[PDB]
Structures are given as C-alpha cells and as structure tokens.
C-alpha cells in the first residue's frame, strides 16, 4: 500500500516513487564519467532502433552552459523538458547575479532542487532520468556529480549509471589513478563502454566529449583576453575514431 | 548449508564463446568454409 | 489503514504517517552532537562509500546555517536540502531585520513550526530530517537541541539521532560527566562511533566533524567544520587508527 | 644540455655506419661529464631545481649503458649502475634504475654477472632509499635466478615478497609473484601447489583487468598446468587466448613468448587426433608469416 | 502471548572470545594449524553466527583436499575467511551506491 | 520444411550434425482451419493420421491416461510415417500460478 | 561426485565433507546442462524435482509434496537432490 | 500487468516505465492508415492514405496530412481527437515564434516544442498524453530536407525516411533494403515531381495494394512552400506510373 503514493512512506521508511524511479534509471543506455586532473570525460552510446533515424538529431551530450555539460540514462522524453528547465533556471538565478554562467557546484543544486520539487508535489511523477554533470570552474577545480531523481545529488571521482553500471563500475575500480591525462582519460572511456557492446562499436554512435581547458577557437570573437572560451567541447565521430585506431 | 557457490559468466570472454562454438566441431566435422572464429568477435552478451 | 492520508487519527490516536516517517531516520547515518560546557561538538557518520566515490573534498552532513548555528544531519539527503535552504533564510532573515544574530531557541522552534505544517495541512508527506542544532547565542551560552521529524524539539547536553539510536545513547551516558571537556568530547564522540558503525575500518573517508566553541578565541565564536586530512589527524590519537 | 645530449646521439650513429672505436672514446667523454653533474655543482648543475639539464642526464643513461649488444663494453659498464642511486638520491631515480637493470638482461648477457650488481642495488634501496625501490629488484632477481636454473633462491625471495604483501591488499605487485610462483613449482613437478598459487593469482587480480600483457602471461600458465591434467580442450582455449594478446601488442621480447605459445596450440589437437585442428592453425595468417 | 512461553533466551552473534573456541574444537577433530595460528585468524575476521566459524574450518580443510596434503597451514585458514566474506557482500552493496 | 524435409532424408540433418527438427505449436483464433492443415501436411507425404481428443476419456488421473498415452505412441512407431497431432494438449497444462 | 569415489579421502582430513551446492549465474548459462551430466556419472540415485511442480493444489498441499521428496531421497541414500528453479520458493519478504 | 497505475501516468510500475504511457503507442493504430515520407534532394513527399468507406463522407475534408504555417506540413496517425489538438497547438506554436524571434520556424524548432509539449502532459495528472504519432515535414532554411517524427510520449528523432501505421514494418524493410543498396541517405531525383512518383511506387510494393485517386492524399514540401495536392492532380502523377 506504501507504493502508490509519494506521500505514503513504508514502515521501514522511504518513499516507492522515488525507489520505482531508480529502477527506471538503469533501464536506460551507458553512461559513465572519469575525473581527471586537467579535465572530466563523459561519455554514452547511442540507438534509435531503427537505422533510417539519423543520430545526430538525438543528443544524448548536451552542454547545459557553455563550461558545462551533461549526460542522462533513464526515459528520453524526461531528459529533454529537464534540459530546457535548468539553462533556463541557470539564466535566472546566477546569469543575472554574476552576469555569466554559474560553477559547476552552484548548477548541481539547482538541477537536483527541480527533482525536489517533481517529488513534493503529489499527482506530479518523479522525472524518469539520473543526470551526471560535469563541469569546471575557478575555484574548486574540474568535477563531476551525479543527479538522482530523488533530489539528492552526490560528488564522484568516477561513476556509472544505467544498464552496464555494475560491470562498468567494476572496470572503474580497477583501472582509476588518481592522475590522469585528459587523453588517458578518453582511452579508459571508449574502452568501458566497450564491454557494454562490441560489433556495433564505432565512433558513429558512441557520443563522447569533455570539459577540458579552453578553447579560444569556439569562442567566436578575438581581442577580449580576459574572458575564456568553452570549456566544453564535442568530439566528432571522425575524431573519435582516431582514438578507437589508436586503442 | 550452502558450502561451495558456483559462479558462471555470462558474457563470456573470447576463451568461453570459443569453446561453445567448439562443441560443432565435436559434435560433427564442419567445412573449410566454416570459420568460426567470425562468431566470437560480434558477440557482447551471448549465453550458451 | 490509516497510513492513507497523513490528516487522519487512529482508533488509538497514533498516526501511522508520523512513525513511518520517524523511522526513516533510522535508515540514514549516525549523528552525534555532543554538548560540553567549553564547546560543543557535532560528528557524523556517511552512509555512503566506494573508492570512487569522492568524500575527501566535502561535506553533505554540516552545514553552517548562519555564523554561530549549524546543524548536523540525518535522514533523507531530498527532504534535508529544503528545509536546511528555509532555515538559513529565517536565521539570517533575523539578522537583517534586528541587526544581530538569531538566537538558539528561536531558530528550531521556526523550522519545528515548517515540519509540523507538512503533517497538519494538505495532502503532502511530512519531512523526514531530525536536524541536530548546535548554537550559541548569549541568553543561555551553548545549547543543543535536536528536532522530532514530527516537529518539536527539545534541548540537550548530548543527543545522538541517525542511524542505531538506541545503542549510541546508551554508550555516550556511560563515559560522559558534567564537568567535561571539549577535547574529551571529540574522543567520546569517535569512542561511540566505532561501535555503532557496521563498518570495521572506520577511517577519515566516512567521518564529518565541526567543533563549535566560544573558547575559540575570546569575546569570539568560531564555527569549524574541520577538513579532511584534521580529521585524519584525530583518528591515531584516539587510536582507533 | 645540448653538448651531452648531442654527443649521445652523436655517439649511436658511429656504431652503425662507422668503426666501432670512435663510438665508445664518446661514451668516455660522456661518463666523466654526466658524473659531475649527478653530484651536482651549484646544487643542481644549473642552479635550483634540477631543471632541463639534470633530468636529461639520468635520461641518457640507459643508451650510454646499453645501447649495445653483447660486447666487453657491456660487460665493463653494469656493477655502475648500482653506483648513481647513492650519487643521485631523486624520487625518479627509483624508475630509471628499474628500467636501466631489466635492460642489460634483455640484450645478450651472461646471467652471473648481472646478479652480483642486482644484490649490491637491493642493499643500496633497503639501507635507507625507499622500499619501493627493494620490491621490484626482488621480484627481477627471482626470475633471473629461475632462468640459471637455481629454484631455491627464487623461492626465498617470494616468501619474504608474500608476507609483507599479506599486510598490504591492494599491491598488483603480488600478481606478478604468485605468478611466477607457479612456474618454479612447474620445473620441481609440484603441480599441487603451481595451482595453489595459479588460483592465488587471480584472487589477488581483479579478473584481467590488470595490464594487458600480465594476462598474456597468466593465460600461458593456466595452458600449461592444464595439458599435463590431460585436458586440451581448456589448454587449447588458453594459449589462443594469450598467443591474441602477445601477437596484438608490439612485441620488444613478446615474438619469442608467442612462439612458444604458437607451438603447443599445434601440440595439443596432435594428442587427441583433430589433424583438421592443426592444419586450420597452420596457413601462413601469422604461423609462417611474422 | 505471554504465559506460554515468557522466558526467553537470546543466542547472540558470536564474539572473538566466542569464536577462538569455535575454531578450536572443529580443528581438534580435523588437523590442527601448524604453528597454531587457529586463535590469530579469529581476530583478522570475526564471524556474524557460529556457522559462520564453521565456514572457516570447512572451506580451509577443502585446500588440503585439493593438494592432498595430511596438515593444513595458517595460509589455508586466511585464504578461508576470505570465501565467508563474499556472501555479507552479496546481500548488501547497493547501499552504498545510489542510497538516499 | 519442418516436416517433410528431414522425414524423407535424415540423411542430410545428419550431414551437418544439428538435430531434424520437430515440434510445431499451432495457433491463431479459433476457425483459422488448422487442424484442416494438420490434414493437408500429411495428405501429402501420405502419413497416417493419429488425431487424439484428451477430454472425455481423460481427467485429473494419470492412472487411466498413462494407458492411453502408451498406445498411441507405439501405433505411430509402426505405422511411419506417422504424424501424431495432440489435440487438446492445453487441458493436460497447467502453470506454477 | 568426489565424496563418493573416494570418502576415504575426506575421513583422513577429517574434513566435514561438502555440502548445498549453489549453481548461479544470469539465464542460459548451462545450469540444467551442467547436472544432466551429474547424472550419469555419479552412478547412484537421482532426484529431480523442479518448481512448477512444487506448487499448492489443495491449501496446505505445498509442505506435504516437501517431506516426501526428502524421505525418498534418503530411502535411497546416497542419492543427490536437485530442485532446477528455487527462484520463486525462495523469496526474502512479503507485504501479503 | 495491474492494479493501480495503468489508472495513472504519474505513478510509476515496479518496471520503471508508464504502462498507460504505452497504451497510446497501442492507440495508434486505431484509425487503420499508413504514411511514408521521404526526402528528395530539395523536397520532402508525404502521403498518407484516404478511407472514404461511405460514399456518404466527402473525400476532401476526409484528411490527415494538415497545413501547419508557411512552410510546414503534419501527417498524423491515430485518432482525430488529439490530431486536431496537436494540428492546433502546432499552428500556435509556428505562429508565435514569429514574433518573437522574427523568421520561419525550422521544422526541428517546432518539433522539439511539441515533443516537450507532450512529456508536460504525461508530467501532470491532470492531463493525459496525447494519442497520436506526428509526423512533421518541412524543407528548411538553412538544413534543406527534414522529416522529425515526434511520437506522443514526447520522444523526437529524424528520418531520412519514416513510416507510421499498422503496416509499417513492412514499408520500413522496404526502406532499408533500397537506401541501402543505392549507398545513399537521400533519393537523387532532382523534381519534386519524380520524387512523388517514386514515392507512390514504394507505397504500392510495400502494402501489396493498388490504390486509387480517391485513396491518397499527398502534401509536398518544397522550399519555401507546403501545399496539398487536390485528387485531380494527383491523378497525374498516377497515370505517370501507370504506363511508364
Ligand atoms: N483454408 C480453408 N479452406 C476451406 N475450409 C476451411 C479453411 N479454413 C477453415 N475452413 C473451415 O472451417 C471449419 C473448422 O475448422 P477446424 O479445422 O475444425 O478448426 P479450429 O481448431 O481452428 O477451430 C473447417 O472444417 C472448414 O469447413
Ligand atoms: N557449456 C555449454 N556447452 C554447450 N551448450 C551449452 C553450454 N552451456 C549452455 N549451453 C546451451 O544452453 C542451453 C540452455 O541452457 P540451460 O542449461 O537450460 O540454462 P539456465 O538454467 O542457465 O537458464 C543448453 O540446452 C545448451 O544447449
Ligand atoms: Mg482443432
Ligand atoms: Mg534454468
């Protein structure tokens, strides 16, 4: 009887909707995230169950600001509303009150707050998605969060969510330092994901991109040196398949 | 109980997809047009 | 039953909603304030671990709600973001208005008030946070109170709500006396935590702690969370390490 | 900088399109240059930190040393590689002297006059260095040791290793021993106890996710142990495995463990009969081919 | 309910105290440890029930059975505790990853 | 293709060693004419026919059952080829429920 | 099988021989396969019961259909019991 | 299976996914059409069948493909009901961008709006999703030819082809196996004319069915402009086919 409210909570405590919204999670495609020292990698694969749909119309890496980007697993509808929601929550409360895009540590509490909120109201769901976040900032460094739909969100080195977690996660352990070049970085990533599938991997539908260090060439205007460039960056498939070569 | 627990993959490394297509040959010789080493790349997650 | 709203009685006068969300808290980490008369102490215990998982840069179980109250915390991380928000807000909404600092006493009674309001009105679940204050305001020195997720409170020279309650009360009564330290605290508080945690290593990675004194300094009130590499520190000197 | 580094590579080329006396009167000069740098003449031989020229030093050591090949030069240079560890002292010396003590085995060297130098450096880390510096040259010694076919002294070294790796949990450093544990075990017709410590290796691993080419040598092990049990089936799979890893990687001392593994794939569907088995191996894919 | 029956008897989770004469006795039957380190290993795992003591001795003699070998060693009972932990990890491990 | 083909050559199925293959599950709404095709497969090969009912001669029991079960079996052994088509194969299932 | 060919074997230990043996993994893995083989080779009695089989037809009917098997199993003795699925028997908690 | 919450799309199921989110992947196929689009190489066709079963029924207000603004076009599958909604909401939707942000909207801006359109109303309670597959057509203005299907969970994906309906995997196999073969993502007629007639022969193969003047309905995409094809021009690309 404790299920089907949000409202109820069992005898030995939590709430099922939110218990119910993980499950959903984990249905949802691979995707991991390694910190490094000098950047954060994230990367997910990609399907559309059919190959007459494109797969450059889906983005399942989104920069959610210009120095920060994000990656799901869990219902793709959920995703692309929740998106929408946090730019637009990212403009409001911080766009305005530094004039620029918030750090990466300020957004994270932000996103999990409209969580919060899709819980404490009852006849509105959970959204169906775990977030991890990644971004960089002046203070506190490079860094990586996940987001739950419970409206808690945690710090991590590395983490993995969705179908491959487990195993993936395992591989994690294992294979982490503690210093890692930004390109090392990438190779522990592309190789992960593999274990999630193989004869199906190419750098076409694997999306895998960074936070690293600026890049004035994404900047779009010259002359201003006191400002930085995109943080983040999009690999290309071409790209990526210069490191699938070279693994 | 419950003294000796048996763990299976199930994913299979290369080495166990191998010797599970190996049992055809076992089984009943097989063509020199047969590889059957084309099968252990494409699988991910391919039980017995 | 009448589990089904959460503004329904019993045939006995119990409701099942304030017990079932009293019990929640039993599933989140121990907590431990312990009040001394030259300092009070707040110690928690993570309830979350792996060697990925980064909890050497951070704290998620203190929070300094203004300069002189913080609180420790237990139960839901969701339910807890919320109501630790609203509390800062009200604690230095005071110190707008009046133009000194919140006192003790007033703070929780404010955020007692917000918890109890989640039970009484509407159709919305309670929230399941006991919050541990420790505070000091010059009306009645150092106080330390905790709050019911039922939404009351009362004070206290040493509490301990989170996970394994019962088993932590207990050990904290046996070794504590009036007179005490502050520095005999901090070894008290790490003396119960090694017994009341299911982990056996117990090593920084899974351990909170912030001091707050008035004897840091003088005519001053310092609030330290302490860092990591502190908390280290304390842990061969207790010897539990 | 420029001088030592220039004379280094100036000194390679006269090896091999030039007469071989000219090659070493530049490794001469070089000894006397780079020794005065090492222990240091304005606290770095630069002033400050060490900066580009003292970390190029230590650098070109391991092609002043060895370029070489089995020549009395060879010879003459290895009890001196013990030496620099006192004269230097740096936290990466501790890598160089690892890397330079594994090279003179792998070009042609006698095997006794390697050992000497390999104690006298085991004492120089364990006197006052790092311990970290003592564990490598342990583990390299014990095999050095197996290789002159003295069994003894290699399993005294593994049983002070395992010990102290019974205090420590996370250490790789004792896959490597367990391992090679095993094969001392194989050659006294211990086959108890080459499982007992094959077994031992996979615990103290996290599956094969441990480097790529420690997995080569892992799989050949479980190859052998099981062919003499008289299943070659499971010996077969194994070495298929291993020989993948050797042939896929960049083989550097890894052609002659391939072909030994590339062998007993052939040896094990001759015990049973499959005479279709040994010749599906043998085209000229890589069996007559690299 | 509560006249029936109103005494009780706990049997609590074993101590190390508890757990060293567990050991011994299992071995008194079996091949004692050579060097006598039946003691030592109580302390480097204690156990969660007394069958879990058991566990231990069961699970160290089966390396014997393997070698064929007449004793059994401090080696083969450290190796054995390790065998018991798995199965407090198998039930619990989502606990501390994506809890609350 | 199920039927017919390793019927008149095992030879081959055992050619490549995997197994002649057999057990065909027919459905769709009732009236589709399936048991009319059950007829027409075997009209062709000439098989003989073995339709069983399993309800009015059979219950609960597997006392009297298991005697009926045996003859049909070993008529069709006899008489091969012969298709056996167990009719009302779905009152003698059940489920773990 | 080995308690069987050589229970000589585990008496010189003094050993207390083994026991339940938990087969696992996800579906396809070979479980069913693995002690058809048991079967043949043990050369002694054999038990296979499975859990579709182990179901209530009357109330109270389950636990009657237990004691039997069990009783069989050591009428028999040495005999090796297999239960295929204990995936719905065994189950840790209930609201019900 | 059931109990509570096939009643709501606001609780979850112990799978993780909305099972009456489902139903309307499974409402869909009420209304027994198919549709297929393609894109040229500077136009899009779609063509949607025609039910008239009664003569009674006026074969021109009998539609299912919709002009949406200027340069965009709808096919959609499943019931009239939530056809005419979304049909609605997207005419306000193009409308309003306009004076906002000044030029055409892309038919990508206009698919992902309606897609996040379509989560809200499985968000609330209060509302239930929609029952229909939108199928949007348009030639962009800086993208060229674009077909985005948005389905009414509020997922949205491009197409270099899509096919919607009952019958609709067996006009997919018939997609893939002619993309594939050419080596191409795109058919390299270069009329708009020649592309409706590859369009209908494609239609025609897969069904199985020979179809009628009175049984298609065509809307086509060009740059800059949308229209629908009345029966009697659509005659002339049939009698195209016809004899060759
Ligand atoms: N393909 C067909 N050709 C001719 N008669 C048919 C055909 N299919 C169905 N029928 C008719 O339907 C009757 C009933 O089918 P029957 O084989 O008894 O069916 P089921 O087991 O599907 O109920 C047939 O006896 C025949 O008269
Ligand atoms: N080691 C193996 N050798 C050959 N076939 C195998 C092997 N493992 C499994 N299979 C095949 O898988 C089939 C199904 O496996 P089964 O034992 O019924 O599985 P589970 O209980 O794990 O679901 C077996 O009938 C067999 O054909
Ligand atoms: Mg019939
Ligand atoms: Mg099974």
């Not at chain 1, 020292?37 to 169950?49: D, Y």
């Not at chain 1, 959610?64 to 697993?73: F, K, R």
């Not at chain 4, 003295?150 to 490597?176: G, T």
Request: aromatic fraction near 8%.
């Amino acid at each position: 009887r404790y299920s089907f409210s949000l409202t109820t909570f069992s005898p030995s405590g939590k709430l099922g909707q939110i218990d119910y919204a993980l499950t959903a999670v984990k249905q949802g495609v691979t995707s991991l995230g390694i910190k490094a020292t000098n950047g954060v990698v994230i990367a997910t694969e990609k399907k559309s169950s059919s190959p007459l749909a494109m797969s450059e119309t889906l983005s399942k890496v989104s920069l959610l600001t210009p120095d920060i980007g994000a990656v799901y697993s869990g219902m793709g509808p959920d995703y692309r509303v929740l998106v929408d929601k946090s730019r637009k929550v990212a403009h409001t409360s911080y766009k305005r009150i530094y004039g620029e895009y918030p750090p990466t540590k300020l957004l994270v509490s932000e996103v999990a707050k409209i969580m919060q909120e899709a819980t404490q109201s009852g006849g509105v769901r959970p959204f169906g998605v775990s977030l991890l976040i990644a971004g960089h900032d002046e203070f506190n460094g490079f860094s990586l969060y996940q987001v739950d739909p419970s409206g808690s969100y945690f710090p991590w080195k590395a983490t993995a969510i969705g179908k491959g977690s487990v195993a993936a996660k395992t591989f994690l352990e294992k294979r982490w330092n503690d210093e890692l070049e930004l390109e090392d970085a990438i190779h522990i990533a592309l190789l992960t994901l593999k274990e999630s599938v193989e004869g199906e991997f190419n750098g076409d539908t694997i999306e895998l991109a960074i936070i690293g260090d600026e890049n004035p060439d994404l900047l779009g205007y010259t002359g201003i040196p006191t400002d930085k460039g995109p943080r983040f960056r999009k690999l290309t498939s071409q790209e990526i398949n210069d490191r699938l070569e070279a693994l | 109980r419950l003294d000796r627990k048996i763990e299976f993959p199930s994913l299979r490394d290369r080495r166990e997809r191998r010797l599970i297509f190996g049992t055809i040959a076992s089984k009943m010789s097989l063509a020199p047009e047969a590889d059957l080493d084309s099968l252990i790349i494409r699988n991910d997650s391919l039980s017995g | 039953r009448y589990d089904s709203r959460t503004t329904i009685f019993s045939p006995e006068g119990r409701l099942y909603q304030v017990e079932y969300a009293l019990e929640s808290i039993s599933h989140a980490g121990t907590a431990i304030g312990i009040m001394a008369s030259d300092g009070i102490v707040l110690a928690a215990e993570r309830k979350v671990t792996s060697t990925l998982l980064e909890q050497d840069t951070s704290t998620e179980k203190l929070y300094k709600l203004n300069d002189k109250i913080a609180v420790a915390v237990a139960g839901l991380t969701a339910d807890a973001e919320i109501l630790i928000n609203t509390a800062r807000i009200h604690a230095q909404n005071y110190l707008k208005t009046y133009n000194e600092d919140i006192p003790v006493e007033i703070l929780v009674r404010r955020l007692s008030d917000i918890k109890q309001g989640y039970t009484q009105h509407g159709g919305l679940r309670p929230f399941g946070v006991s919050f541990i204050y420790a505070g000091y305001d010059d009306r009645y020195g150092y106080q330390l109170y905790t709050s019911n997720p039922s939404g009351n409170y009362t004070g206290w020279k040493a509490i301990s709500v989170g996970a394994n309650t019962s088993a932590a009360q207990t050990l904290l009564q046996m070794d504590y006396k009036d007179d005490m330290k502050v520095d005999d605290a901090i070894e008290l508080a790490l003396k119960t935590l090694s017994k009341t945690t299911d982990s056996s290593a117990l090593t920084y990675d899974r351990l909170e702690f912030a001091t707050i004194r008035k004897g840091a300094n003088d005519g001053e009130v310092y609030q330290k969370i302490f860092k990591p590499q502190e908390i280290k520190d304390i842990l061969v000197k207790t010897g539990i390490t | 900088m420029s001088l030592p580094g220039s004379k280094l590579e100036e000194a390679r080329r006269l090896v091999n399109e030039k007469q071989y006396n000219e090659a070493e009167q530049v490794y001469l000069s070089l000894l006397d240059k780079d020794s005065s740098q090492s222990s240091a003449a304005a606290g770095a031989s630069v002033d400050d930190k060490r900066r580009n020229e003292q970390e190029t030093s230590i650098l070109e050591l391991g092609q002043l040393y060895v370029t070489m090949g089995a020549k009395d030069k060879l010879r003459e240079f290895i009890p001196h590689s013990t030496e620099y560890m006192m004269q230097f002292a740096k936290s990466k010396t501790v890598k160089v002297l690892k890397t330079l003590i594994e090279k003179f085995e792998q070009v042609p060297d006698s095997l006794d006059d390697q050992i000497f130098v390999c104690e006298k450096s085991i004492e120089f880390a364990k006197r006052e260095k790092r311990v970290f510096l003592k564990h490598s040259l342990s583990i390299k010694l014990a095999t050095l040791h197996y290789q002159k076919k003295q069994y003894k002294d290699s399993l005294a070294l593994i049983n002070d290793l395992l010990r102290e790796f019974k205090k420590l949990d996370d250490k790789p450093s004792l896959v490597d021993v367990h391992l090679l544990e095993s094969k001392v075990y194989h050659k006294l017709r211990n086959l108890a106890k080459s499982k007992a410590s094959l077994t031992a290796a996979r615990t103290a691993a996290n599956s094969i996710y441990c480097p790529t080419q420690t997995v080569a040598e892992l799989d050949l092990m479980s190859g052998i142990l099981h062919c003499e049990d008289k299943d070659y089936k499971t010996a077969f799979s194994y070495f298929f495995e291993s020989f993948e890893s050797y042939h896929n990687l960049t083989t550097h001392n890894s052609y002659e463990k391939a072909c030994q593994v590339l062998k007993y794939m052939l040896l094990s569907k001759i015990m049973l009969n499959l005479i279709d088995d040994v010749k599906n191996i043998l085209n000229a894919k890589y069996t007559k081919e690299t | 309910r509560p006249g029936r029956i109103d005494r009780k008897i706990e049997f609590p989770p074993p101590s190390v105290a508890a757990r060293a004469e567990i050991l011994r006795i299992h071995s008194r039957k079996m091949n004692l440890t050579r060097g006598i380190n039946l003691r030592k290993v109580a302390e480097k795992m204690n156990g969660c029930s007394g069958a879990d003591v058991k566990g231990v001795c069961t699970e160290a003699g089966m390396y014997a059975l393997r070698e064929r070998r007449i004793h059994v060693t401090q080696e083969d009972f450290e190796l054995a505790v390790g065998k018991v932990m798995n199965k407090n990890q198998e039930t619990a491990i989502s606990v501390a990853k994506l809890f609350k | 293709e199920v039927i017919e083909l390793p019927l008149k050559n095992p030879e081959i199925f055992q050619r490549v060693g995997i197994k002649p293959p057999k057990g065909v599950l027919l459905y769709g709404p009732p009236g589709t004419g399936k048991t009319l095709l059950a007829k027409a497969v075997a009209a062709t090969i000439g098989a003989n026919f073995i339709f069983s009912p399993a309800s009015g001669i059979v219950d609960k029991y597997i006392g009297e059952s298991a005697r009926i079960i045996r003859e049909m079996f070993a008529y069709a052994k006899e008489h091969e080829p012969c298709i056996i088509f167990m009719d009302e194969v779905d009152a003698i299932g059940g489920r773990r429920f | 099988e080995l308690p069987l060919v050589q229970a000589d074997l585990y008496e010189q230990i003094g050993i207390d021989p083994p026991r339940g043996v938990l087969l696992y993994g996800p579906p396809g893995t070979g479980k069913t396969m693995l002690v058809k083989a048991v079967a043949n080779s043990t050369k002694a009695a054999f038990i296979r019961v499975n859990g579709s089989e182990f179901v209530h037809k009357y109330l109270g009917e389950g636990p009657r259909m237990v004691r039997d098997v069990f009783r069989l199993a050591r009428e028999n003795a040495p005999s090796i019991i297999f239960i295929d699925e204990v995936d719905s028997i065994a189950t840790k908690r209930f609201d019900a | 299976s059931a109990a509570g919450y096939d009643r709501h799309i606001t609780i979850f199921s112990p799978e993780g996914r909305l099972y009456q989110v489902e139903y309307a992947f499974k409402a869909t196929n009420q209304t027994n059409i198919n549709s297929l689009a393609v894109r040229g190489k500077d136009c899009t066709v779609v063509i949607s069948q025609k039910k008239v079963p009664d003569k009674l029924l006026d074969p021109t207000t009998v539609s299912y493909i919709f002009c949406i603004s200027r340069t965009i076009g709808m096919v959609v599958n499943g019931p009239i009901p939530d056809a005419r909604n979304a049909a609605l909401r997207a005419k306000a939707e193009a409308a309003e961008f306009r004076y906002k942000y000044g030029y055409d909207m892309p038919c990508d801006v206009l698919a992902k709006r309606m897609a996040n359109l379509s989560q809200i109303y499985t968000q609330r309670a209060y509302m239930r999703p929609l029952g229909v597959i939108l199928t949007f057509v348009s030639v962009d203005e800086e993208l060229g030819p674009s077909i985005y299907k948005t389905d009414p969970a509020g997922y949205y994906v491009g197409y270099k082809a899509t096919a919607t309906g009952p019958k609709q995997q067996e006009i997919t196999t018939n997609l893939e196996n002619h993309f594939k073969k050419s080596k191409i993502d795109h058919i390299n007629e270069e009329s708009w004319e020649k592309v409706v007639e590859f369009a209908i022969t494609h239609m025609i193969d897969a069904l199985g069915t020979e179809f009628s003047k009175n049984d298609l309905e065509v809307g086509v995409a060009t740059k800059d402009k949308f229209f629908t094809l009345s029966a009697e021009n659509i005659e002339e690309r049939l009698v195209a086919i016809a004899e060759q």
